[PDB]
Design a protein around this ligand. Structure first.
Ligand SMILES: O=S(=O)(O)OC[C@H]1O[C@@](COS(=O)(=O)O)(O[C@H]2O[C@H](COS(=O)(=O)O)[C@@H](OS(=O)(=O)O)[C@H](OS(=O)(=O)O)[C@H]2OS(=O)(=O)O)[C@@H](OS(=O)(=O)O)[C@@H]1OS(=O)(=O)O
Ligand SMILES: O=S(=O)(O)OC[C@H]1O[C@@](COS(=O)(=O)O)(O[C@H]2O[C@H](COS(=O)(=O)O)[C@@H](OS(=O)(=O)O)[C@H](OS(=O)(=O)O)[C@H]2OS(=O)(=O)O)[C@@H](OS(=O)(=O)O)[C@@H]1OS(=O)(=O)O
Ligand SMILES: O=S(=O)(O)OC[C@H]1O[C@@](COS(=O)(=O)O)(O[C@H]2O[C@H](COS(=O)(=O)O)[C@@H](OS(=O)(=O)O)[C@H](OS(=O)(=O)O)[C@H]2OS(=O)(=O)O)[C@@H](OS(=O)(=O)O)[C@@H]1OS(=O)(=O)O
Ligand SMILES: O=S(=O)(O)OC[C@H]1O[C@@](COS(=O)(=O)O)(O[C@H]2O[C@H](COS(=O)(=O)O)[C@@H](OS(=O)(=O)O)[C@H](OS(=O)(=O)O)[C@H]2OS(=O)(=O)O)[C@@H](OS(=O)(=O)O)[C@@H]1OS(=O)(=O)O
Ligand SMILES: *[C@@H]1O[C@H](CO)[C@@H](O)[C@H](O)[C@H]1NC(C)=O
Ligand SMILES: *[C@@H]1O[C@H](CO)[C@@H](O)[C@H](O)[C@H]1NC(C)=O
Ligand SMILES: *[C@@H]1O[C@H](CO)[C@@H](O)[C@H](O)[C@H]1NC(C)=O
Ligand SMILES: *[C@@H]1O[C@H](CO)[C@@H](O)[C@H](O)[C@H]1NC(C)=O
Ligand SMILES: [Ca+2]
Lengths: 416, 15, 299
């Protein structure tokens, strides 16, 4: 049943399903009609003539209101529902929409379906932190230079793909209703084809919050005429559908994002990993340095082996380098009188008991080498023989050999 | 013909 | 049956990307109380908004045709009735690149022979059985194992022979040739090995280290390494040692050794005298150049 497990049961890359992260989520907007209730006018073009139909926006009445909840609700072509900004909030004044996902998402697109005509100037912003600092994502304007201080129709540079680009595309006043602006995060980016191996673009698609700012709106130039009321009431920002598409950032180690004990969206990490985005590795699995999963290689986090003598292991870069990029996990504070990186042998002054396996508690017996008999403390690990001096027959160098008598000298314990 | 007819180890690694 | 509400979100969605098409498969929603008239497939690069295909409720699978080769499409599935369109189900896929069928290769050149002329020049001669007009050109490649992880040097030739220049002396090289007519081209010919002629060394021995031996201070060991430009098989080494540097080679005592050994113990050395050292390499063609003297005093 598990997508992380293969047909035999081997590890494989895990990707969460493609979702519209915006759907059903609360969006904070700067303006909404109805408080106090004001009149708005819908403009419609047919042939060479323009027609205007004026309606009222009442926040209290459900059929007359246009709340920010109408951006994120289900989009129905038969019954469209759009949010509407306050009348005539033209440049310098702007209308912004902040969306908080509350987790790192690998954004593929950011789309907006408009009820009113598309803006003359719009910008998409993202947040790496959970709303502290903002970095631009994409700009849309007639004058990229004068409005957003970016080159107009700039081609995507290989040198900086992590930079927001400005275009005059999708800014046209026509269609006056139903206009769409869909931003493709990996569009035109030269190394987008090799995304799995490109961390530069992997960071570019990452966002925790999305902010869309409407800076300048399209106008006919009739607002400055004798009658300002009728004209200024027919210019506003209205959006029916806001879609932020993309998968949950889990670095290829999770198939789904689940809400935890503190009601926070987190990846359900696999391949022996842990973290909100599976960026780090589960304790006692530091045998290999952390690496993001690819299509060909699963890049699972390798478990430590201490032969059940140590509870904590640490990663050594030098040992990983000396192993030829194979393993670098060294066990910490080896118990039951054992030593070594993988805690596989008995420490100096101890020997292995052959009757019981290495995983057992009593795997290493004490090597009781005589202080005057034996030369050294460290003995034979497989047989349990102390390094005897003057050919001592003792197992722990305790008894003199045949014909040999015990001596007063500490250098020569037995004399023939 | 050209072949040999206990092995001792020697190691060297930097700090 | 039930048109009082908008259809429920579909249960499953599965894509299968091909070279120019995407096989889409789905399953209707779990709830049957709300009637469903059909399915709406929404595809496109980056966003699913590009194009929309509406199908009947009976349909369970659909292959999206006429697509770009290596593009990343986002497919969206909606369940629709008379009241409207339901909650969408999203999935993304990257189409497989357009594979071009490879041409049937040509016959490679035969009779490839390496003829060593000098220490830096080897001429390569090859034949062609295909030749009984054409604009076919031959390509030559060569590589030495030192330095490590180096690549083959390529050179184009229109005639049946090529003169290789800029080679190192006394070093084994591998040679092979290929024929290229156009989109059709033959693989590399049988590897022919050519070893360059030996030459007089052009570089002196590097890393000259002199140190006082612990035990018998009257004896001091000299350590040297072979030079980079050996230009052949080294047969011997000449060590020079004297108290004065300004004096010519004729004044300095000659101490030659064997080539297979890079160490030599010097016995009976004078006390409170500053010793200077110079080492040279021996070859079949000539002798290695002189090296810079090193300072070492005795107590
Ligand atoms: O000039 S009017 O007679 O249209 O005066 C405005 C009031 O008309 C409504 C009700 O329609 S009416 O009975 O024909 O007058 O208009 C609004 O609703 C209709 C649909 O009719 S229905 O009776 O509610 O079922 C919409 O028409 S249509 O788009 O379906 O063709 C109107 O849309 S529009 O003005 O043509 O763009 C719609 O008008 S509005 O967007 O609300 O302004 C009443 O509105 S209602 O309460 O929402 O139904 C108006 O009365 S009100 O007291 O000002 O609210
Ligand atoms: O018309 S505006 O008042 O909006 O100002 C025009 C400014 O655009 C430039 C370049 O802007 S910027 O590089 O982004 O700062 O026009 C010049 O560059 C663009 C882009 O270059 S390129 O050749 O396309 O790669 C050219 O546009 S385009 O042809 O590519 O579409 C301009 O050529 S053209 O007028 O469109 O035919 C090009 O103008 S020019 O041939 O260099 O004269 C700036 O011009 S520039 O400073 O002379 O390079 C203008 O900025 S300025 O401060 O008003 O000078
Ligand atoms: O040029 S090489 O093909 O030999 O590769 C060396 C480049 O690898 C980096 C980073 O690449 S990464 O590992 O993919 O993130 O350095 C690091 O990796 C190598 C492994 O190379 S190997 O051929 O597989 O063995 C380590 O070298 S080694 O100890 O295994 O010989 C590096 O160790 S060290 O810096 O030499 O001490 C290791 O560096 S580090 O632990 O990340 O610091 C690149 O180095 S980097 O730019 O400093 O990160 C190497 O690129 S380079 O252009 O050769 O400088
Ligand atoms: O339609 S067919 O009758 O021709 O059947 C083809 C089915 O085989 C797959 C899956 O094979 S499997 O995952 O090995 O079980 O084809 C793919 O086969 C391997 C994947 O191997 S791997 O071990 O999972 O890595 C890949 O080829 S290769 O690159 O290793 O040479 C291809 O997948 S991928 O491009 O890496 O994603 C793919 O081969 S295809 O190149 O010609 O065959 C299934 O294709 S798939 O849906 O695209 O993954 C086919 O399954 S199906 O049920 O018939 O649809
Ligand atoms: C419509 O607006 C008026 C403004 O005075 C308000 O009193 C009224 O309650 C609103 N309509 C509804 C149904 O709430
Ligand atoms: C239909 O559209 C109107 C627009 O004001 C909205 O009040 C209503 O809730 C919509 N109904 C559904 C089911 O979306
Ligand atoms: C929008 O207006 C606010 C002030 O209301 C300002 O801080 C911001 O810089 C303006 N521009 C954008 C693109 O948000
Ligand atoms: C050989 O000729 C081809 C075609 O002109 C060219 O692509 C290639 O680089 C040439 N190689 C050399 C070393 O001249
Ligand atoms: Ca809506």
């Amino acid at each position: 049943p598990d997508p992380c497990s293969d047909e035999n049961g081997h590890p494989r890359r895990c990707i969460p399903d493609f979702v519209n992260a915006a759907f059903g989520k609360d969006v904070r907007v700067s303006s909404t009609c109805g408080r106090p209730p004001a009149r708005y006018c819908v403009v419609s073009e047919r042939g060479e003539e323009r027609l205007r139909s004026c309606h009222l926006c009442n926040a209290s009445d459900p059929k007359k209101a246009h709340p920010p909840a109408f951006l994120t609700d289900l989009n129905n072509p038969h019954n469209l529902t759009c949010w509407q900004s306050e009348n005539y909030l033209q440049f310098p004044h702007n209308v912004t929409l902040t969306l908080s996902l509350g987790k790192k998402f690998e954004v593929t697109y950011v789309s907006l379906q408009f009820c009113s005509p598309r803006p003359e100037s719009m910008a998409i912003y993202k947040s790496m932190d959970y709303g502290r600092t903002w970095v631009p994502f994409q700009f849309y304007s007639t004058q990229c230079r004068k409005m957003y201080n970016r080159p107009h129709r700039a081609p995507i540079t290989k040198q900086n793909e992590q930079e927001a680009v400005c275009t005059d595309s999708h800014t046209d006043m026509r269609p006056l209703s139903g206009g769409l602006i869909a931003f493709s995060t990996l569009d035109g980016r030269p190394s987008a084809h090799d995304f799995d191996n490109s961390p530069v673009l992997q960071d570019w698609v990452t966002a925790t919050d999305i902010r869309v700012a409407f800076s300048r709106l399209h106008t006919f130039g009739d607002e400055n005429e004798d009658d300002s009321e009728l004209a200024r009431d027919s210019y506003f920002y209205a959006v029916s559908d806001l879609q932020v598409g993309g998968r949950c950032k889990c670095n290829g180690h999770a198939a789904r994002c689940v809400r935890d004990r503190d009601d926070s969206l987190v990846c359900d990490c696999r391949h022996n990993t842990a973290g909100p985005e599976c960026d780090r590795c589960k304790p006692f699995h530091y045998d290999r340095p952390w690496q993001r999963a690819t299509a060909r290689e699963a890049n699972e986090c390798v478990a430590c082996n201490c032969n059940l003598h140590a509870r904590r292991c640490r990663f050594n870069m030098e040992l990983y380098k000396l192993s030829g990029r194979k393993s670098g996990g060294v066990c910490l504070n080896c118990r039951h009188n054992t030593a070594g990186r993988h805690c596989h042998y008995c420490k100096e002054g101890y020997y292995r008991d052959m009757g019981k396996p290495i995983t057992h508690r009593k795997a290493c017996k004490a090597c009781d080498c005589h202080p005057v008999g034996a030369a050294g403390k460290t003995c034979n690990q497989t047989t349990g023989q102390c390094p005897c001096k003057d050919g001592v027959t003792g197992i722990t160098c305790n008894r003199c050999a045949k014909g040999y008598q015990q001596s007063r000298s500490p250098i020569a314990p037995c004399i023939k | 013909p050209c072949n040999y007819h206990s092995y001792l180890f020697c190691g060297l690694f930097g700090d | 049956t039930g048109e009082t509400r908008v259809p429920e979100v579909p249960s499953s969605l599965h894509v299968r990307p091909l070279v120019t098409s995407i096989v889409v498969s789905w399953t209707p929603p779990e709830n049957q109380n709300i009637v469903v008239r059909g399915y709406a497939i929404g595809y496109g690069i980056g966003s699913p908004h590009a194009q929309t295909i509406k199908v009947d409720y009976k349909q369970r699978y659909y292959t999206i045709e006429n697509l770009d080769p290596s593009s990343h499409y986002v497919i969206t599935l909606k369940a629709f009735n008379n009241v409207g369109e339901g909650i969408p189900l999203y999935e993304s896929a990257v189409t497989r690149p357009h594979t071009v069928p490879d041409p049937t290769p040509m016959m490679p050149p035969v009779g490839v022979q390496a003829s060593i002329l000098s220490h830096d020049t080897i001429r390569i001669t090859w034949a062609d059985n295909s030749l009984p007009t054409d604009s076919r050109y031959y390509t030559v490649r060569w590589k030495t194992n030192i330095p490590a992880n180096t690549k083959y040097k390529n050179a184009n030739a229109t005639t049946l022979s090529y003169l290789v220049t800029g080679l190192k002396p006394n070093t084994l090289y591998e040679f092979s040739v290929m024929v290229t007519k156009g989109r059709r081209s033959s693989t590399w010919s049988m590897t022919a090995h050519g070893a360059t002629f030996e030459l007089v060394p052009t570089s002196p021995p590097k890393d000259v280290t002199v140190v006082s031996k612990e035990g018998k201070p009257r004896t001091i060991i000299v350590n040297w390494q072979p030079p980079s430009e050996a230009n052949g098989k080294i047969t011997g080494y000449i060590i020079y040692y004297s108290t004065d540097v300004n004096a010519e080679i004729h004044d300095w005592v000659i101490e030659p050794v064997v080539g297979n050994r890079l160490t030599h113990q010097i016995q009976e050395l004078t006390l409170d005298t500053p010793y200077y050292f110079k080492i040279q390499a021996r070859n079949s063609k000539g002798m290695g150049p002189m090296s810079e003297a090193v300072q070492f005093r005795t107590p």
